[PDB]
Amino acid sequence: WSATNEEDDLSVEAEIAHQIAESFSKKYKFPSRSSGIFLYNFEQLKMNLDDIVKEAKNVPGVTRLAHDGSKIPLRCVLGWVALANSKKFQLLVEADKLSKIMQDDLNRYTS
């Protein structure tokens, strides 16, 4: 039988989990509210990996990239998951600039 949707989802999750774990402590740059930057990593989220992976799959293009075994846009994913979950991140970040950086990264990975 061809791969089922459930089987493909498991494959995608294991690929995303691998890429996120591999770079879990890597510090990425995010826009502050004063024309500066702050550093953040997946380790700051204090979320279980499953919850991180489930939210990452929502970033458009990430499921396709993971299905294909291609590199995912990790800074964009982190920004998104942190925006959805982390109060400290919310207070540090300038949302309008975050939108632009996430879009720039994501457009630049999905083509």
Which CATH number fits the domain that encloses residue 61?
1.20.120.820
The sign one gets for the Cα dihedral 32, 47, 60, 107 is positive
Kindly provide the b/e burial profile for residues 33-45, where b requires at least 16 CB atoms within 10 angstroms of the residue's own CB: eeeeeeebebeeb
The number of distinct structural domains making up the chain is 1
Cα-trace Rg, the chain: 14
Resolution value (Å, 1 decimal): 1.5
**Element spanning 32, H or E:** none
Alpha carbon distance 102, 81 (integer Å): 11
Q: Which of 103, 63, 61 is nearest to 79 (CA)?
A: 103
3-state secondary structure of 31: strand
- Locate the DSSP E strands across 11-95: 28-31, 37-40
Range of the domain at 26: 1-111
Alpha carbon distance 1, 88 (integer Å): 47
PDB experimental method: X-ray
Bridge partners for 38 per DSSP: 30
